[PDB]
Amino acid sequence: SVLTSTAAADCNAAVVIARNGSAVASPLSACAVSADGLSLTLTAAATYKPMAGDTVDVAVSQTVLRAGSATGPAYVPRPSPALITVPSP
Secondary structure (H helix, E strand, C coil): CEECCCCHHHHHCCEEEEECCEEECCCEEEEEECCCCCCEEEEECCCCCCCCCEEEEECCCCCCEECCCCCCCECCCCCCCEEECCCCC
16 A cells, blocks of 8 residues: 555544544654555654554545555545554553
């Protein structure tokens, strides 16, 4: 997968970051993708630090991130947010 656009505003509109049902506004400052495209490379915001817990999902009906390619099928929300072992108690 690859991001169609990588502007600061565009990055925050692609995913929703929450913890215990409470979301976080503009949790990122930038975004990118790995060379092989098998993983994302997100730049965090300055309002939190790593403490081994978090969760993340994708915004409903978003089109910024597309699998296959930048012109392939788009991502859709998971049944539940995926786990991230970083910024939250």
